[PDB]
Amino acid sequence: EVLFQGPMEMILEEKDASDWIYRGEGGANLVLAYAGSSPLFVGKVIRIQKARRNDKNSNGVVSVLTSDEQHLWRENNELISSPNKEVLEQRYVQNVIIPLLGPKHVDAGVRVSVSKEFLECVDKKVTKQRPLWRVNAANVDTSHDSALILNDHSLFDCISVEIKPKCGFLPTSRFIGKENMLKTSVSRFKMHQLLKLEYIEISEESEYDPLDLFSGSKERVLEAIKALYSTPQNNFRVFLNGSLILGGSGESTGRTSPEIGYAFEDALKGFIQSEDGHRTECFLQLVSDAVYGSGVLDRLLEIQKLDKLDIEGAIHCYYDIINQPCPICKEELSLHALPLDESLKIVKEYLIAATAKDCSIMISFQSNAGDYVSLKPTNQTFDYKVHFIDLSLKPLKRMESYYKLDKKIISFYNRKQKAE
Ligand SMILES: O=P(O)(O)O[C@H]1[C@@H](OP(=O)(O)O)[C@H](OP(=O)(O)O)[C@H](O)[C@H](OP(=O)(O)O)[C@H]1OP(=O)(O)O
Ligand SMILES: Nc1ncnc2c1ncn2[C@@H]1O[C@H](COP(=O)(O)OP(=O)(O)OP(=O)(O)O)[C@@H](O)[C@H]1O
Ligand SMILES: [Mg+2]
Ligand SMILES: [Zn+2]
């Protein structure tokens, strides 16, 4: 009844850069929340890929996947034919992860086209709010023609929490050698804290142990969340309506000092309804109920355990996949006696586990003022949602780095334990 021009593909131009604020960032992507007008963007974030400042198929053409990654992920043509890295992460989540993890807490993204001018702006603008050692190691990849749009998981007063639970299980492989028996006793997360000190990457050993979080015991789950609150590092963040109010911003943070402790107790003023000196403890018993009560950590743990054999065994399958003289083996004859397809599934499955040990989850909480919980103490009812984030695809080449880091972790823990 009045001409509406047919559909078109959204393309953020240089104009539209002023509409997004720095939200955070990891070692790979740059997240920014929307501050403007359009309903196509109210309550959404945009995920832009950074590129390390140090760094192609056999015609010297930039390539989404090596041949081996091509072969390894071939059980899905959609996925191994992705022309750029955004559809690739978008099809990894839809075709590999969502079938494993269920679709209810996992939102594959939506691609938006973007100009090089857009990306060159957001970089210039945000580099103020980034931690300094993030800029000096990765800027915005100003070649991509796509970026990711997701729902913002700190909105719908609202208080959101972000957990990075990491690997919550002990290996039991035959391929773990006697000198490394400790790996069957101490969580890699625990043995990793030492080496991180020996590199001033944290200042205090973490209170947190992922064996508690994943124990499935609501009691030890509460220990974890209390341990997270205490020594947050890069495992625990809290935001009040979009803004951080505990934990690091694109980085980890030192112990929670009482000063922070009192700033957080009041930060919760009114959201939690309680008397001073008791709102922090309620907030922690409310996050523990939403964690436990969703059963979301359980299937998460099921994927992590696709790491059946530990890097000490999967490493050997990898030098098969890329046909190579196993450096490790010198003088298995077993793992190396496996049909190619079985070599492939171990390496494949190990990398899908690496995705699960590395994602985060975000529980979001709104006010009284269906899906919910009720603080046993303060007679309040909050509603919540839980979502995963950073289900990225780990590059195959990294099997060698996975191994070399594992080797160092236990090698360091061994000696620092024998020293006594
Ligand atoms: O231990 P390394 O290798 O440095 O890094 C870990 C991980 O690599 P991998 O675990 O998949 O090998 C990185 O993956 P990427 O983001 O590059 O895809 C990040 O998730 C990083 O987080 P960050 O510390 O930057 O926040 C992790 O460190 P964490 O141990 O502190 O969680
Ligand atoms: N959908 C979302 N809603 C709200 N915040 C988000 C969302 N996605 C990412 N973030 C924030 O941006 C930060 C970095 O994003 P993301 O994890 O996707 O990139 P990454 O570099 O792979 O990081 P990580 O290794 O921490 O998962 C996260 O720590 C998170 O707080
Ligand atoms: Mg990542
Ligand atoms: Zn070998």
GROMACS .gro file of C-alpha atoms and ligand atoms in nm:
model
  485
    1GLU     CA    1   0.000   0.000   0.000
    2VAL     CA    2   0.318   0.211   0.005
    3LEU     CA    3   0.644   0.107  -0.152
    4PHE     CA    4   0.886  -0.059   0.090
    5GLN     CA    5   1.215  -0.134  -0.087
    6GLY     CA    6   1.305  -0.502  -0.081
    7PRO     CA    7   1.556  -0.653   0.160
    8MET     CA    8   1.921  -0.550   0.182
    9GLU     CA    9   2.224  -0.661   0.381
   10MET     CA   10   2.321  -0.436   0.670
   11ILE     CA   11   2.662  -0.271   0.619
   12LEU     CA   12   2.808  -0.065   0.901
   13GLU     CA   13   2.993   0.226   0.739
   14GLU     CA   14   3.254   0.454   0.898
   15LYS     CA   15   2.962   0.671   1.016
   16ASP     CA   16   2.829   0.406   1.251
   17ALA     CA   17   3.145   0.365   1.462
   18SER     CA   18   3.036   0.625   1.720
   19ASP     CA   19   2.746   0.393   1.826
   20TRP     CA   20   2.954   0.129   2.010
   21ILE     CA   21   3.138   0.136   2.343
   22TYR     CA   22   3.423  -0.089   2.455
   23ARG     CA   23   3.279  -0.381   2.655
   24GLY     CA   24   3.577  -0.613   2.687
   25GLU     CA   25   3.807  -0.842   2.496
   26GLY     CA   26   3.998  -1.168   2.519
   27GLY     CA   27   4.304  -1.303   2.349
   28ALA     CA   28   4.124  -1.322   2.014
   29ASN     CA   29   3.816  -1.100   1.982
   30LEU     CA   30   3.703  -0.748   2.064
   31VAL     CA   31   3.354  -0.710   2.210
   32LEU     CA   32   3.159  -0.381   2.204
   33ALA     CA   33   2.808  -0.298   2.330
   34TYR     CA   34   2.553  -0.080   2.150
   35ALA     CA   35   2.472   0.270   2.273
   36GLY     CA   36   2.237   0.400   2.006
   37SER     CA   37   1.898   0.396   1.845
   38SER     CA   38   1.817   0.130   1.586
   39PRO     CA   39   1.602  -0.166   1.700
   40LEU     CA   40   1.831  -0.391   1.495
   41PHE     CA   41   2.094  -0.326   1.761
   42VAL     CA   42   1.927  -0.247   2.093
   43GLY     CA   43   2.068  -0.497   2.341
   44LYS     CA   44   2.327  -0.655   2.109
   45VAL     CA   45   2.707  -0.671   2.108
   46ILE     CA   46   2.945  -0.694   1.814
   47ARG     CA   47   3.246  -0.926   1.814
   48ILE     CA   48   3.538  -0.805   1.605
   49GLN     CA   49   3.842  -1.022   1.550
   50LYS     CA   50   4.185  -0.903   1.656
   51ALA     CA   51   4.502  -1.019   1.483
   52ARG     CA   52   4.837  -1.079   1.648
   53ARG     CA   53   5.090  -0.830   1.502
   54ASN     CA   54   5.329  -1.116   1.397
   55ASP     CA   55   5.208  -1.317   1.092
   56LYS     CA   56   4.786  -1.891   0.313
   57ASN     CA   57   4.724  -2.170   0.057
   58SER     CA   58   4.963  -2.288  -0.220
   59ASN     CA   59   4.874  -1.983  -0.441
   60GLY     CA   60   4.974  -1.741  -0.164
   61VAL     CA   61   4.609  -1.661  -0.091
   62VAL     CA   62   4.481  -1.596   0.261
   63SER     CA   63   4.310  -1.913   0.378
   64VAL     CA   64   4.038  -1.984   0.633
   65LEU     CA   65   4.163  -2.342   0.692
   66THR     CA   66   4.478  -2.536   0.615
   67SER     CA   67   4.445  -2.856   0.415
   68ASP     CA   68   4.469  -3.061   0.735
   69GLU     CA   69   4.199  -2.859   0.908
   70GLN     CA   70   3.999  -2.904   0.589
   71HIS     CA   71   4.045  -3.280   0.612
   72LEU     CA   72   4.007  -3.301   0.991
   73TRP     CA   73   3.672  -3.109   0.997
   74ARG     CA   74   3.544  -3.263   0.671
   75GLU     CA   75   3.246  -3.434   0.839
   76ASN     CA   76   3.041  -3.127   0.736
   77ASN     CA   77   3.079  -2.954   0.401
   78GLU     CA   78   2.905  -2.633   0.510
   79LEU     CA   79   3.180  -2.582   0.770
   80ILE     CA   80   3.497  -2.655   0.570
   81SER     CA   81   3.383  -2.430   0.287
   82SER     CA   82   3.346  -2.108   0.493
   83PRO     CA   83   3.497  -1.823   0.284
   84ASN     CA   84   3.600  -1.609   0.587
   85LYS     CA   85   3.652  -1.658   0.960
   86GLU     CA   86   3.316  -1.519   1.071
   87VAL     CA   87   3.100  -1.772   0.888
   88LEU     CA   88   3.356  -2.032   1.004
   89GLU     CA   89   3.302  -1.957   1.376
   90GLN     CA   90   2.931  -1.923   1.299
   91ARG     CA   91   2.914  -2.270   1.140
   92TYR     CA   92   3.135  -2.433   1.403
   93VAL     CA   93   2.886  -2.337   1.671
   94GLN     CA   94   2.583  -2.443   1.468
   95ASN     CA   95   2.715  -2.765   1.318
   96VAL     CA   96   2.969  -2.907   1.571
   97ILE     CA   97   2.895  -2.752   1.912
   98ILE     CA   98   2.516  -2.698   1.922
   99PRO     CA   99   2.451  -3.067   1.835
  100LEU     CA  100   2.669  -3.157   2.133
  101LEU     CA  101   2.560  -2.887   2.375
  102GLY     CA  102   2.191  -2.834   2.299
  103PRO     CA  103   2.061  -2.506   2.152
  104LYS     CA  104   1.905  -2.357   2.468
  105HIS     CA  105   2.211  -2.178   2.617
  106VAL     CA  106   2.409  -2.132   2.293
  107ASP     CA  107   2.327  -1.859   2.042
  108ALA     CA  108   2.512  -1.884   1.717
  109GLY     CA  109   2.574  -1.529   1.600
  110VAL     CA  110   2.448  -1.320   1.310
  111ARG     CA  111   2.691  -1.178   1.054
  112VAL     CA  112   2.691  -0.812   0.958
  113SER     CA  113   2.901  -0.682   0.673
  114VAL     CA  114   3.147  -0.408   0.766
  115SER     CA  115   3.371  -0.162   0.588
  116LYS     CA  116   3.744  -0.131   0.645
  117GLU     CA  117   3.670   0.226   0.755
  118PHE     CA  118   3.442   0.101   1.034
  119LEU     CA  119   3.707  -0.134   1.169
  120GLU     CA  120   3.986   0.124   1.138
  121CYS     CA  121   3.771   0.355   1.354
  122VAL     CA  122   3.668   0.122   1.634
  123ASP     CA  123   4.035   0.037   1.682
  124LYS     CA  124   4.156   0.398   1.704
  125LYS     CA  125   3.869   0.480   1.941
  126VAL     CA  126   3.882   0.193   2.190
  127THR     CA  127   4.261   0.163   2.234
  128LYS     CA  128   4.216   0.398   2.530
  129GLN     CA  129   4.003   0.153   2.740
  130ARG     CA  130   4.197  -0.161   2.652
  131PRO     CA  131   4.463  -0.289   2.891
  132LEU     CA  132   4.800  -0.177   2.760
  133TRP     CA  133   4.945  -0.527   2.696
  134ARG     CA  134   4.642  -0.619   2.487
  135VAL     CA  135   4.703  -0.335   2.241
  136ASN     CA  136   5.076  -0.411   2.229
  137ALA     CA  137   4.992  -0.771   2.120
  138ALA     CA  138   4.678  -0.743   1.898
  139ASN     CA  139   4.490  -0.467   1.710
  140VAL     CA  140   4.172  -0.484   1.502
  141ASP     CA  141   4.204  -0.704   1.191
  142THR     CA  142   4.121  -0.435   0.933
  143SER     CA  143   4.076  -0.682   0.646
  144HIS     CA  144   3.761  -0.871   0.753
  145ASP     CA  145   3.441  -0.790   0.566
  146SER     CA  146   3.226  -0.938   0.844
  147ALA     CA  147   3.173  -0.914   1.219
  148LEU     CA  148   2.950  -1.094   1.467
  149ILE     CA  149   2.637  -0.957   1.634
  150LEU     CA  150   2.515  -1.132   1.949
  151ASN     CA  151   2.260  -1.061   2.221
  152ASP     CA  152   2.405  -0.870   2.514
  153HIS     CA  153   2.396  -1.108   2.811
  154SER     CA  154   2.402  -0.837   3.080
  155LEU     CA  155   2.055  -0.699   2.988
  156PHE     CA  156   1.692  -0.789   2.900
  157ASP     CA  157   1.829  -0.306   3.754
  158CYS     CA  158   2.032  -0.604   3.622
  159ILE     CA  159   2.341  -0.783   3.759
  160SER     CA  160   2.530  -1.035   3.544
  161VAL     CA  161   2.812  -1.275   3.631
  162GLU     CA  162   3.073  -1.428   3.402
  163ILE     CA  163   3.252  -1.754   3.484
  164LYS     CA  164   3.536  -1.919   3.291
  165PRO     CA  165   3.526  -2.261   3.459
  166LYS     CA  166   3.814  -2.429   3.267
  167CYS     CA  167   3.888  -2.800   3.285
  168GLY     CA  168   3.708  -2.968   3.572
  169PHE     CA  169   3.841  -3.325   3.562
  170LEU     CA  170   4.156  -3.530   3.626
  171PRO     CA  171   4.311  -3.735   3.340
  172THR     CA  172   4.361  -4.112   3.368
  173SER     CA  173   4.544  -4.202   3.052
  174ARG     CA  174   4.785  -4.490   3.005
  175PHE     CA  175   5.003  -4.253   2.801
  176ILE     CA  176   5.081  -4.038   3.105
  177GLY     CA  177   5.424  -4.156   3.221
  178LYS     CA  178   5.536  -4.228   3.577
  179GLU     CA  179   5.732  -3.902   3.611
  180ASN     CA  180   5.401  -3.722   3.543
  181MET     CA  181   5.177  -3.919   3.781
  182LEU     CA  182   5.090  -3.591   3.951
  183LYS     CA  183   4.862  -3.514   3.653
  184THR     CA  184   4.616  -3.777   3.784
  185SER     CA  185   4.607  -3.602   4.122
  186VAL     CA  186   4.616  -3.223   4.077
  187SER     CA  187   4.396  -3.032   3.835
  188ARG     CA  188   4.597  -2.879   3.553
  189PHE     CA  189   4.441  -2.553   3.671
  190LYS     CA  190   4.609  -2.598   4.009
  191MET     CA  191   4.952  -2.687   3.862
  192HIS     CA  192   4.917  -2.400   3.620
  193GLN     CA  193   4.888  -2.134   3.894
  194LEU     CA  194   5.251  -2.199   4.000
  195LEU     CA  195   5.397  -2.147   3.653
  196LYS     CA  196   5.186  -1.832   3.607
  197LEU     CA  197   5.356  -1.686   3.914
  198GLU     CA  198   5.702  -1.781   3.786
  199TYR     CA  199   5.593  -1.541   3.507
  200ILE     CA  200   5.422  -1.266   3.712
  201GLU     CA  201   5.098  -1.327   3.520
  202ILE     CA  202   4.903  -1.342   3.849
  203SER     CA  203   5.010  -1.212   4.188
  204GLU     CA  204   4.843  -1.473   4.417
  205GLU     CA  205   4.759  -1.840   4.374
  206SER     CA  206   4.388  -1.877   4.299
  207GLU     CA  207   4.146  -1.985   4.568
  208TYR     CA  208   3.940  -2.145   4.294
  209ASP     CA  209   3.950  -2.513   4.203
  210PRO     CA  210   3.745  -2.635   3.904
  211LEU     CA  211   3.700  -2.978   4.064
  212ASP     CA  212   3.458  -2.807   4.309
  213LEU     CA  213   3.263  -2.615   4.044
  214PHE     CA  214   3.211  -2.932   3.841
  215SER     CA  215   3.169  -3.168   4.140
  216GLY     CA  216   2.790  -3.151   4.092
  217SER     CA  217   2.766  -3.104   4.470
  218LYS     CA  218   2.577  -2.780   4.536
  219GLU     CA  219   2.791  -2.753   4.850
  220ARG     CA  220   3.128  -2.749   4.671
  221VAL     CA  221   2.968  -2.539   4.398
  222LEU     CA  222   2.924  -2.271   4.662
  223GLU     CA  223   3.289  -2.315   4.760
  224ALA     CA  224   3.389  -2.243   4.398
  225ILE     CA  225   3.180  -1.925   4.374
  226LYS     CA  226   3.321  -1.807   4.704
  227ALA     CA  227   3.671  -1.895   4.580
  228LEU     CA  228   3.597  -1.705   4.257
  229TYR     CA  229   3.472  -1.397   4.440
  230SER     CA  230   3.789  -1.406   4.652
  231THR     CA  231   4.056  -1.447   4.381
  232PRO     CA  232   3.880  -1.357   4.056
  233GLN     CA  233   4.171  -1.338   3.810
  234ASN     CA  234   4.031  -1.392   3.458
  235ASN     CA  235   3.772  -1.647   3.576
  236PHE     CA  236   3.504  -1.430   3.738
  237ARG     CA  237   3.351  -1.094   3.652
  238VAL     CA  238   3.043  -0.907   3.769
  239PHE     CA  239   2.878  -0.620   3.581
  240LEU     CA  240   2.605  -0.386   3.698
  241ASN     CA  241   2.384  -0.285   3.406
  242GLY     CA  242   2.662  -0.340   3.153
  243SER     CA  243   2.953  -0.201   3.357
  244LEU     CA  244   3.217  -0.406   3.537
  245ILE     CA  245   3.203  -0.384   3.918
  246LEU     CA  246   3.443  -0.667   4.008
  247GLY     CA  247   3.697  -0.867   3.814
  248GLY     CA  248   3.920  -0.751   3.536
  249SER     CA  249   3.831  -0.566   3.216
  250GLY     CA  250   3.979  -0.766   2.930
  251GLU     CA  251   4.223  -0.900   3.193
  252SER     CA  252   4.252  -1.070   3.532
  253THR     CA  253   4.282  -0.889   3.865
  254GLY     CA  254   4.444  -0.919   4.206
  255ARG     CA  255   4.288  -1.059   4.520
  256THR     CA  256   3.966  -0.897   4.641
  257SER     CA  257   4.093  -0.654   4.903
  258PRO     CA  258   3.844  -0.537   5.169
  259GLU     CA  259   3.845  -0.198   4.992
  260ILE     CA  260   3.705  -0.365   4.681
  261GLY     CA  261   3.500  -0.577   4.919
  262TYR     CA  262   3.324  -0.270   5.060
  263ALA     CA  263   3.287  -0.113   4.714
  264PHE     CA  264   3.113  -0.433   4.598
  265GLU     CA  265   2.886  -0.463   4.905
  266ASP     CA  266   2.743  -0.119   4.825
  267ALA     CA  267   2.751  -0.175   4.449
  268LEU     CA  268   2.480  -0.433   4.530
  269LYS     CA  269   2.280  -0.176   4.732
  270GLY     CA  270   1.910  -0.216   4.657
  271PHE     CA  271   1.950  -0.487   4.393
  272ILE     CA  272   2.003  -0.726   4.682
  273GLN     CA  273   1.772  -0.626   4.967
  274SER     CA  274   1.967  -0.668   5.290
  275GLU     CA  275   2.153  -0.491   5.570
  276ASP     CA  276   2.509  -0.369   5.518
  277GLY     CA  277   2.770  -0.641   5.561
  278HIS     CA  278   2.541  -0.915   5.427
  279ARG     CA  279   2.461  -0.839   5.061
  280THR     CA  280   2.784  -0.986   4.922
  281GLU     CA  281   2.717  -1.323   5.087
  282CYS     CA  282   2.362  -1.327   4.946
  283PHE     CA  283   2.488  -1.252   4.596
  284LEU     CA  284   2.725  -1.549   4.615
  285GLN     CA  285   2.454  -1.785   4.738
  286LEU     CA  286   2.232  -1.663   4.452
  287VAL     CA  287   2.490  -1.728   4.177
  288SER     CA  288   2.555  -2.071   4.324
  289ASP     CA  289   2.185  -2.158   4.299
  290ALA     CA  290   2.165  -2.054   3.932
  291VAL     CA  291   2.482  -2.244   3.846
  292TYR     CA  292   2.372  -2.563   4.022
  293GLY     CA  293   2.007  -2.527   3.928
  294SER     CA  294   2.056  -2.509   3.552
  295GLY     CA  295   2.257  -2.832   3.520
  296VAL     CA  296   2.454  -2.646   3.253
  297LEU     CA  297   2.799  -2.742   3.387
  298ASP     CA  298   2.719  -3.112   3.340
  299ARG     CA  299   2.699  -3.141   2.960
  300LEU     CA  300   2.976  -2.885   2.946
  301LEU     CA  301   3.183  -3.143   3.135
  302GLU     CA  302   3.072  -3.414   2.892
  303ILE     CA  303   3.234  -3.231   2.600
  304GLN     CA  304   3.556  -3.156   2.791
  305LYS     CA  305   3.595  -3.530   2.844
  306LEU     CA  306   3.620  -3.580   2.467
  307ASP     CA  307   3.987  -3.526   2.563
  308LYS     CA  308   3.989  -3.903   2.633
  309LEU     CA  309   4.364  -3.960   2.607
  310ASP     CA  310   4.529  -3.636   2.734
  311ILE     CA  311   4.771  -3.432   2.523
  312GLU     CA  312   5.031  -3.689   2.621
  313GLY     CA  313   4.853  -3.933   2.392
  314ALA     CA  314   4.678  -3.715   2.137
  315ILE     CA  315   5.011  -3.555   2.048
  316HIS     CA  316   5.113  -3.880   1.875
  317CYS     CA  317   4.794  -3.893   1.668
  318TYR     CA  318   4.876  -3.542   1.549
  319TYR     CA  319   5.213  -3.628   1.392
  320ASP     CA  320   5.019  -3.899   1.210
  321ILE     CA  321   4.751  -3.657   1.086
  322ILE     CA  322   5.015  -3.426   0.937
  323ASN     CA  323   5.227  -3.728   0.839
  324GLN     CA  324   5.540  -3.660   1.039
  325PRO     CA  325   5.816  -3.842   1.223
  326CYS     CA  326   5.691  -3.835   1.579
  327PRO     CA  327   5.949  -3.630   1.769
  328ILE     CA  328   5.800  -3.756   2.097
  329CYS     CA  329   5.844  -4.127   2.031
  330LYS     CA  330   6.215  -4.215   2.037
  331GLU     CA  331   6.437  -4.489   2.178
  332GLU     CA  332   5.454  -4.583   2.101
  333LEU     CA  333   5.416  -4.836   1.823
  334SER     CA  334   5.054  -4.855   1.947
  335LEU     CA  335   4.876  -4.525   1.890
  336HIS     CA  336   5.083  -4.511   1.569
  337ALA     CA  337   4.934  -4.848   1.467
  338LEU     CA  338   4.578  -4.685   1.431
  339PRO     CA  339   4.384  -4.645   1.106
  340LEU     CA  340   4.392  -4.288   0.976
  341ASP     CA  341   4.025  -4.225   1.058
  342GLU     CA  342   4.087  -4.311   1.424
  343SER     CA  343   4.390  -4.080   1.437
  344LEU     CA  344   4.156  -3.812   1.300
  345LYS     CA  345   3.875  -3.849   1.555
  346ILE     CA  346   4.112  -3.830   1.853
  347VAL     CA  347   4.269  -3.509   1.726
  348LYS     CA  348   3.928  -3.383   1.618
  349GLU     CA  349   3.769  -3.470   1.953
  350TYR     CA  350   4.062  -3.331   2.147
  351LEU     CA  351   4.014  -2.992   1.979
  352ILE     CA  352   3.640  -2.994   2.047
  353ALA     CA  353   3.731  -3.051   2.413
  354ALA     CA  354   3.977  -2.761   2.397
  355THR     CA  355   3.677  -2.549   2.293
  356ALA     CA  356   3.483  -2.662   2.603
  357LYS     CA  357   3.769  -2.599   2.850
  358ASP     CA  358   3.798  -2.244   2.719
  359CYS     CA  359   3.445  -2.103   2.693
  360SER     CA  360   3.277  -1.885   2.952
  361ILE     CA  361   2.922  -1.868   3.078
  362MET     CA  362   2.721  -1.562   3.172
  363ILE     CA  363   2.435  -1.573   3.423
  364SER     CA  364   2.228  -1.256   3.414
  365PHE     CA  365   2.000  -1.133   3.692
  366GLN     CA  366   1.709  -0.885   3.705
  367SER     CA  367   1.512  -0.770   4.014
  368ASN     CA  368   0.918  -0.790   4.233
  369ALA     CA  369   1.000  -0.428   4.155
  370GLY     CA  370   0.907  -1.901   3.493
  371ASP     CA  371   1.288  -1.906   3.479
  372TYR     CA  372   1.419  -1.776   3.812
  373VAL     CA  373   1.547  -1.861   4.159
  374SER     CA  374   1.465  -1.735   4.508
  375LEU     CA  375   1.723  -1.625   4.763
  376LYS     CA  376   1.642  -1.846   5.067
  377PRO     CA  377   1.741  -1.558   5.298
  378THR     CA  378   1.608  -1.229   5.156
  379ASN     CA  379   1.251  -1.316   5.052
  380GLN     CA  380   1.328  -1.199   4.697
  381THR     CA  381   1.264  -1.358   4.357
  382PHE     CA  382   1.516  -1.301   4.077
  383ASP     CA  383   1.481  -1.422   3.720
  384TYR     CA  384   1.791  -1.532   3.528
  385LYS     CA  385   1.930  -1.666   3.203
  386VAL     CA  386   2.250  -1.857   3.130
  387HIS     CA  387   2.449  -1.850   2.807
  388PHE     CA  388   2.781  -1.975   2.679
  389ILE     CA  389   3.036  -1.753   2.506
  390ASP     CA  390   3.368  -1.813   2.328
  391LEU     CA  391   3.292  -2.147   2.170
  392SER     CA  392   3.564  -2.064   1.919
  393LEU     CA  393   3.741  -2.324   1.705
  394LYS     CA  394   4.093  -2.400   1.815
  395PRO     CA  395   4.343  -2.412   1.526
  396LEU     CA  396   4.488  -2.758   1.458
  397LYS     CA  397   4.847  -2.627   1.448
  398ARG     CA  398   4.819  -2.561   1.825
  399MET     CA  399   4.852  -2.932   1.912
  400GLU     CA  400   5.223  -2.866   1.938
  401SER     CA  401   5.175  -2.572   2.174
  402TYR     CA  402   4.922  -2.762   2.384
  403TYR     CA  403   5.186  -3.035   2.429
  404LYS     CA  404   5.484  -2.804   2.500
  405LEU     CA  405   5.283  -2.616   2.762
  406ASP     CA  406   5.156  -2.936   2.927
  407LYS     CA  407   5.516  -3.061   2.939
  408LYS     CA  408   5.633  -2.741   3.109
  409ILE     CA  409   5.345  -2.725   3.361
  410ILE     CA  410   5.413  -3.067   3.512
  411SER     CA  411   5.789  -3.028   3.471
  412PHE     CA  412   5.770  -2.716   3.690
  413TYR     CA  413   5.522  -2.858   3.942
  414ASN     CA  414   5.733  -3.175   3.972
  415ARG     CA  415   6.042  -2.988   4.084
  416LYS     CA  416   5.858  -2.734   4.300
  417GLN     CA  417   5.705  -3.033   4.476
  418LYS     CA  418   6.025  -3.237   4.509
  419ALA     CA  419   6.190  -2.926   4.657
  420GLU     CA  420   6.097  -3.024   5.011
  421LIG     O1  421   4.751  -2.043   2.822
  421LIG     P1  422   4.751  -1.968   2.690
  421LIG     O2  423   4.785  -2.051   2.568
  421LIG     O3  424   4.832  -1.840   2.694
  421LIG     O4  425   4.601  -1.906   2.664
  421LIG     C1  426   4.470  -1.962   2.692
  421LIG     C2  427   4.388  -1.982   2.562
  421LIG     O5  428   4.457  -2.069   2.472
  421LIG     P2  429   4.428  -2.228   2.468
  421LIG     O6  430   4.394  -2.267   2.610
  421LIG     O7  431   4.312  -2.244   2.371
  421LIG     O8  432   4.561  -2.282   2.419
  421LIG     C3  433   4.361  -1.850   2.488
  421LIG     O9  434   4.292  -1.876   2.365
  421LIG     P3  435   4.276  -1.771   2.241
  421LIG    O10  436   4.190  -1.662   2.303
  421LIG    O11  437   4.415  -1.727   2.197
  421LIG    O12  438   4.208  -1.855   2.135
  421LIG     C4  439   4.280  -1.764   2.581
  421LIG    O13  440   4.159  -1.833   2.610
  421LIG     C5  441   4.363  -1.738   2.707
  421LIG    O14  442   4.293  -1.642   2.787
  421LIG     P4  443   4.362  -1.506   2.841
  421LIG    O15  444   4.464  -1.555   2.943
  421LIG    O16  445   4.424  -1.436   2.722
  421LIG    O17  446   4.239  -1.433   2.894
  421LIG     C6  447   4.391  -1.868   2.785
  421LIG    O18  448   4.461  -1.839   2.908
  421LIG     P5  449   4.405  -1.870   3.058
  421LIG    O19  450   4.482  -1.990   3.103
  421LIG    O20  451   4.443  -1.743   3.130
  421LIG    O21  452   4.257  -1.894   3.046
  422LIG     N1  453   2.725  -1.206   2.416
  422LIG     C1  454   2.792  -1.134   2.507
  422LIG     N2  455   2.728  -1.055   2.597
  422LIG     C2  456   2.795  -0.982   2.688
  422LIG     N3  457   2.929  -0.982   2.696
  422LIG     C3  458   3.006  -1.057   2.611
  422LIG     C4  459   2.940  -1.139   2.509
  422LIG     N4  460   3.036  -1.202   2.439
  422LIG     C5  461   3.155  -1.165   2.492
  422LIG     N5  462   3.138  -1.077   2.594
  422LIG     C6  463   3.245  -1.014   2.677
  422LIG     O1  464   3.364  -0.983   2.600
  422LIG     C7  465   3.477  -1.053   2.652
  422LIG     C8  466   3.561  -1.114   2.541
  422LIG     O2  467   3.479  -1.187   2.449
  422LIG     P1  468   3.515  -1.337   2.404
  422LIG     O3  469   3.534  -1.428   2.523
  422LIG     O4  470   3.408  -1.374   2.306
  422LIG     O5  471   3.655  -1.323   2.322
  422LIG     P2  472   3.784  -1.417   2.346
  422LIG     O6  473   3.897  -1.326   2.307
  422LIG     O7  474   3.776  -1.550   2.274
  422LIG     O8  475   3.771  -1.431   2.509
  422LIG     P3  476   3.769  -1.557   2.613
  422LIG     O9  477   3.900  -1.634   2.588
  422LIG    O10  478   3.766  -1.481   2.744
  422LIG    O11  479   3.640  -1.636   2.599
  422LIG     C9  480   3.422  -1.162   2.743
  422LIG    O12  481   3.509  -1.184   2.855
  422LIG    C10  482   3.283  -1.115   2.784
  422LIG    O13  483   3.279  -1.053   2.914
  423MG      MG  484   3.864  -1.758   2.258
  424ZN      ZN  485   5.456  -4.097   1.873
   0.00000   0.00000   0.00000
